[PDB]
Write a protein that binds this ligand. Structure first.
Ligand SMILES: *[C@@H]1O[C@H](CO)[C@@H](O[C@@H]2O[C@H](CO)[C@@H](O[C@@H]3O[C@H](CO[C@H]4O[C@H](CO)[C@@H](O)[C@H](O)[C@@H]4O)[C@@H](O)[C@H](O[C@H]4O[C@H](CO)[C@@H](O)[C@H](O)[C@@H]4O)[C@@H]3O)[C@H](O)[C@H]2NC(C)=O)[C@H](O)[C@H]1NC(C)=O
Ligand SMILES: *[C]1O[C]([C][O])[C](O[C]2O[C]([C][O])[C](O3[C]4O[C]([C][O])[C]([O])[C]([O])[C@]43[O])[C]([O])[C]2[N]C([C])=O)[C]([O])[C]1[N]C([C])=O
Lengths: 261, 97, 49, 106
């Protein structure tokens, strides 16, 4: 119900290896890894966007969260899909992590529709072979017979003793700031804090929030940045960090595996 | 099983860093020159010839093997216990010894 | 710790705070544009066994 | 595809023959699938190119205004090519750049 644990958490956009085909756009559908250290066959997939929580930090069932253009937007869960070679059903959706059982194959993928009504997907190489239990080679749980010990994941969505760390976004490069005059530049349109920097050397970098003019140089000299944080992010190996190298936040790894039959 | 924890690759534009080591398993440092990181916002920094990238990673024991693991033992001499039935007409007992 | 044979990671108990590894880990320079961490490694020996 | 009865460039609708009239239907109900649900990548004129996993068959199915799912299938021994010396199935995020031949989307 409360489970709050998340109040300062924001999705990211990372790089991937396929976006339908060939062109590897920096996409909002990163997949960090696929843990398969259970025994039944399920996969615990952790991906970029997070699901279950609305924009301003409240428990939801069917709405999902994601990022686009470094601002926050939403979508629906009932229009999300996961599959490997054939469409396999999801078995659990909580927080930041996907949970499913799926037939064999050599690729895993996740997708969902955009608030601009699109079909963004992402595929990643991974080998998932049917791991067997007992001295048989079945694929479906039969109705008559015997049972054997095996480990699996539990749907308890609030449990301790495992975690990843959290950091803050370093700074966000852009050239697409409203900075244009005939021999001059105009030095903001924004709603947030900004750090500007250049190399036409008369004034150093600063932390301005209102407009300015630098009166001097063509636009292919200055580059702008979004600056200090409002929330936290995940230390994914695909986006750099700022000089605050710490372990400020940390967050549950749900679904601890337990003995079953 | 093991795991490869990879923290974030701190990039420095037109500068250089110095990686102080850590008492850790296989803490591996690597410093590269001549990089041009090209992220969503055009380029990350603005410089052309003095750019450096820092990549560090280490190898650690995975989090789930607190419940599955192999354990090698040295194996030495053993003992012997038995259970007998001692029937001789008068009341038949069972015994372990 | 022969990398890729039995037990290329070793621990003297369940919960000692020190360990030993010979995973055979190296690093390589990235490509043009992509920011990531190219790391070459021998795959697991335990999962092999 | 792409051409309503009066000459225009629609990115969604498709022209077909029934009763030798000229009827429209959109692309938001066109799927291709051979062994999995295939994935189209570029759609122009009187030809359709797409990447999708290997198999033995191939299919086109789109839906008409009367809401039926007319389709046709044919046999074709498509299989995964071998570039280089390691038979993968999915492009990884670092490797060696090699000469291959692909199509242009113009
Ligand atoms: C599936 O089921 C198996 C059962 O076979 C579970 O294995 C059990 O997991 C628990 C949780 O860690 C184990 O409990 C711990 O065991 C350690 C090893 O036990 C030694 O010491 C005990 C003393 O009671 C001896 O009986 C035994 O022979 C071993 O020599 C202990 O070191 C741990 O405890 C220390 O602290 C506690 C107090 O906190 C003391 O009571 C202990 O004496 C000791 O000083 C702890 O007791 C349990 O041992 C495991 N079973 C077996 C057979 O080893 C799996 O975990 C479960 N699967 C999953 C996924 O959980
Ligand atoms: C004493 O002595 C006796 C002799 O007689 C003996 O015995 C016999 O034995 C047998 C074996 O065990 C028995 O059997 C039993 O029962 C049971 C129940 O369940 C069953 O199952 C089995 O099969 C069997 O049958 C018999 O009964 C006997 N007989 C008599 C008793 O008579 C004995 O064992 C001894 N001991 C005691 C304690 O009794």
């Amino acid at each position: 119900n409360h489970f709050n644990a998340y109040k300062l958490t924001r999705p990211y956009v990372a790089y991937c290896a396929d976006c339908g085909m060939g062109h590897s756009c920096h996409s909002p559908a990163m997949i960090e890894n696929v843990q398969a250290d259970a025994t039944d066959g399920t996969l615990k997939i952790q991906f970029a966007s997070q699901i279950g929580l609305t924009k301003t930090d409240t428990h939801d069932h069917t709405k999902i969260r994601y990022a686009e253009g470094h601002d926050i937007a939403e979508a629906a869960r009932s229009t999300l899909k996961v599959h490997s070679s054939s469409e396999c059903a999801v078995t659990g959706t909580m927080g930041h992590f996907i949970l499913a059982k799926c037939p064999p194959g050599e690729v895993i993928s996740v997708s969902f529709v955009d608030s601009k009504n699109e079909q963004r997907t992402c595929r990643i190489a991974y080998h998932h072979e049917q791991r067997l239990i007992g001295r048989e080679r079945f694929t479906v749980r039969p109705h008559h017979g015997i049972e054997l010990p095996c480990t699996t994941y539990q749907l308890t969505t609030a449990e301790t003793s495992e975690e990843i760390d959290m950091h803050m976004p370093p700074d966000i490069p852009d050239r697409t700031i409203l900075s244009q005059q005939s021999g001059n530049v105009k030095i903001t349109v924004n709603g947030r804090t900004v750090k500007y920097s250049c190399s036409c050397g008369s004034k150093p970098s600063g932390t301005t929030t209102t407009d300015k003019t630098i009166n001097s140089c063509t636009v292919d000299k200055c580059q702008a940045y979004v600056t200090s944080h409002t929330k936290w992010q995940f230390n994914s190996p695909f986006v750099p960090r700022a000089e605050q190298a710490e372990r400020k936040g940390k967050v549950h790894i749900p679904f601890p595996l337990i003995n079953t039959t | 099983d093991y795991k490869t924890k990879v923290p974030s690759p701190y990039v420095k534009c037109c500068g250089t860093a110095e990686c102080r080591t850590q008492d850790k398993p296989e803490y591996k440092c690597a410093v590269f020159t001549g990089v041009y990181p090209f992220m969503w916002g055009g380029a990350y920094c603005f410089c052309d010839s003095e750019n450096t990238q820092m990549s560090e990673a280490y190898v650690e024991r995975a989090d789930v093997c607190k419940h599955d693991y192999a354990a090698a033992y040295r194996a030495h001499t053993a003992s012997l216990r038995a259970k007998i039935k001692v029937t001789y007409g008068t009341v038949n007992q069972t015994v372990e010894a | 710790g022969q990398p890729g044979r039995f037990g290329d990671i070793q621990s003297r108990t369940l919960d000692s705070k020190d360990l030993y590894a010979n995973t055979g880990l190296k690093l390589a320079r990235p490509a043009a544009g992509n920011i990531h961490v190219p790391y070459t490694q021998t795959p697991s020996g335990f999962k092999t066994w």
